[PDB]
From Swiss-Prot, chains B, C, E:
The EC number(s) this enzyme carries: 1.16.3.1
Protein name: Ferritin heavy chain
Designated gene of the protein: FTH1
SUPFAM superfamilies for this protein: Ferritin-like
GO cellular component terms attached to this protein's record: autolysosome; autophagosome; cytoplasm; cytosol; extracellular exosome; extracellular region; ferritin complex; ficolin-1-rich granule lumen
Species of the source: Homo sapiens
Subunit structure: Oligomer of 24 subunits. There are two types of subunits: L (light) chain and H (heavy) chain. The major chain can be light or heavy, depending on the species and tissue type. In the human liver, the heavy chain is predominant. The functional molecule forms a roughly spherical shell with a diameter of 12 nm and contains a central cavity into which the insoluble mineral iron core is deposited. Interacts with NCOA4; NCOA4 promotes targeting of the iron-binding ferritin complex to autolysosomes following starvation or iron depletion.
Phylogenetic lineage: Eukaryota, Metazoa, Chordata, Craniata, Vertebrata
Gene Ontology BP, a term: immune response
Record bears the keyword Iron: yes
Pfam families named in the record: Ferritin
Coiled coil ranges: none
Catalytic reaction annotation: 4 Fe(2+) + O2 + 4 H(+) = 4 Fe(3+) + 2 H2O
Amino acids binding Fe cation 2: E58, E98, Q132
Amino acid sequence: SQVRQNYHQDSEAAINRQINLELYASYVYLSMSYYFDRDDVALKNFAKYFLHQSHEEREHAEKLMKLQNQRGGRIFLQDIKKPESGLNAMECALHLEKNVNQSLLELHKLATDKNDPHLCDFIETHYLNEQVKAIKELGDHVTNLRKMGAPESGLAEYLFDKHTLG
Amino acid sequence: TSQVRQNYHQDSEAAINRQINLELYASYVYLSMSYYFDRDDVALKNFAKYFLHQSHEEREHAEKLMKLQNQRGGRIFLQDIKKPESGLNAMECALHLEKNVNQSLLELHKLATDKNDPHLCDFIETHYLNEQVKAIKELGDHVTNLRKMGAPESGLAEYLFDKHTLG
Amino acid sequence: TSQVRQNYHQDSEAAINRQINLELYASYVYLSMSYYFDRDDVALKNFAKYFLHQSHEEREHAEKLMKLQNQRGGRIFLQDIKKPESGLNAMECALHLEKNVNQSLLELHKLATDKNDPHLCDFIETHYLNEQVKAIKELGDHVTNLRKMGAPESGLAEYLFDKHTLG
Amino acid sequence: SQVRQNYHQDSEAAINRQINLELYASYVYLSMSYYFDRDDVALKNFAKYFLHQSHEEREHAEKLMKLQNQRGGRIFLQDIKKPESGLNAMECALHLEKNVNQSLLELHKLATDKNDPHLCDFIETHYLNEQVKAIKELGDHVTNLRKMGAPESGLAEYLFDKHTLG
Amino acid sequence: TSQVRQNYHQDSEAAINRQINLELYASYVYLSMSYYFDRDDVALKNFAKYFLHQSHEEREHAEKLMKLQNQRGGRIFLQDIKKPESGLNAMECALHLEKNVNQSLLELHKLATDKNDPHLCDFIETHYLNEQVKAIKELGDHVTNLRKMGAPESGLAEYLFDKHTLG
Ligand SMILES: [Fe+3]
Ligand SMILES: [Fe+3]
Ligand SMILES: [Fe+3]
Ligand SMILES: [Fe+3]
Ligand SMILES: [Fe+3]
Ligand SMILES: [Fe+3]
Ligand SMILES: [Fe+3]
Ligand SMILES: [Fe+3]
Ligand SMILES: [Fe+3]
Ligand SMILES: [Fe+3]
């Protein structure tokens, strides 16, 4: 690639793996979103919240595909793997976002070891603080749903859906 | 016979008249439910407004079928409109009402299909079938939330639903 | 018995439920008349719009009585709504319909007077009695004009009236 | 009085008694309003609701004083007599409004017996339907507070204060 | 054969080419009618404007079918457009014209149904079948009013209709 400079093959491969994971996270959120749209669940603000999360993750993948091309790497796509209560879904989302953050931190370590400061600052600027805020927000939600009495209390999940996500 | 009548089978004409009576009946059921929740000893005013809007919507459904009857050169035949406890119970009654209306409309579409009346088929599809699907899904959502909130045993649940979903 | 009920006689409560049924019947009659003039073999579209507006007014008359029933602590009891030639003849049928409703309202007011229910008396006076007088005078004006123009023998007359008075 | 016409002495005296009762009702509502402003009760929308009721009743008395002068009667004022939970207060207000309505209906009967149609229509137009709506509204409130679990449930009274009176 | 063609039968392609010619014929008929009423010895200008607008609408019906032909990968085949007394008689000829176009469209839909072409079925339903129903009902309303007013013997009737209905 006529533009490639200081871009290690390990970083390129890791970006491609991270692209797959962000798309996977988007798929997970899409599944959760339409679960809460079911007539026997019917927490429509849970559904909207997860649908917005799904769209954010897809944007996270497209930005990495953009970065791959900017640095002269080559995008390699793989299959996107297929993905009970409002509290349980927030706990799965929290654990999902921590797995994505962990992957991003290992990516940043790789970029650091290969002395790629542009990639390091790109990850810091567009991904690391977003994950921290996403994880903190999901922790806030898990805490409130538990203190209110979820998942045994359906009233708690209804009122949270109205007052926090609505 | 009508100067405008074309490809309009007498069985369709009759079935449209029965569907008009059923839509008017549904409007009557919703009107009763609306003023039940306006009672001073029930007093769930957003349930009442919700059901009153459903009543007006069913009356519009009946009037559009009367319009269609005239458009196709059929003749309207009207019959008596038959006379029609908690917020959850009423939502369940409405859900069953909408599925009974839906079933009739699907039987109407099957008759129109069998008589090769594509205009009536698409008319029913465009103005009624998806309206019923959305109404049934919405009523299913309401029933689920009221159950999950603790209705009918919890009057608090029905109160908060009236405020946060129907209000 | 209601916590809000005060000075509201059982006879008045039953008479209001009967009046609700009559108002819904009148609405049904006007609805029937409206779509008759929408037929392709009658096709007097402003007659149709006029009677449809009357149909909706009668339904508001019934809902306001249902509201009053709840306000006073009575209990709504609904019954079957019974099923209902020229523009002149429809105006004449409407005139008699409104006079029969007026007569029922006047007997209702006499009942409220005899029960010393001044709130019900003023409710009937404010929302119904003058509305009936204006409807009856208007319908008499329409009948008179159609007759003088040469209806029902003159189809031209009914066409021009639809355009110049109801249009 | 140069303006007095068809205005019985019994009607004039009854209007003066009704003036006293409307002022009494205003005093009752003022007491209830500042009870819910107490720091150990603190239902501020209950307090605002009753304060508005207090101001309406005073207006009811001033309109009757106006009517007294319009018909050539003479206003005679008397002492205004001094007047636990949100539900109990609504029940006291409901019973208060029914006592005022009863007094107004006896007033109308008096006006009817004395063949005073102006007074009859004045009472019908400005007082009878207002009482019916006031009594119906208070009945709605009592019903909702009970179905929600008042007075044992303080949560019920808090949420009603926010969602109905707020 | 076309790179875009999918599930588009040869008989459907030919039938659409026949329908195109018929819509163009109908437009020519309305065009003839419009300028007849513009004649100095007929001189019903709103009849003339009404029929000219019908002529333009039929032309658009033909162009949308030509667009559909290209969309589905068919090939347009054009043929000669064949050459086409009172206001009432012209409305009656128009009514009969629209019923013949509707009949042709209904046979078109039966063919599309037989070929399992749901895109074509819904295209016909959405853009043609309900337009035909509305056009036929409107023309029947016009014929009925003209007859009731005393047309065609009454020249006064056709003038007033031209002013109050078409104007
Ligand atoms: Fe992400
Ligand atoms: Fe940095
Ligand atoms: Fe319906
Ligand atoms: Fe709330
Ligand atoms: Fe009425
Ligand atoms: Fe004129
Ligand atoms: Fe007062
Ligand atoms: Fe009066
Ligand atoms: Fe056409
Ligand atoms: Fe369709």
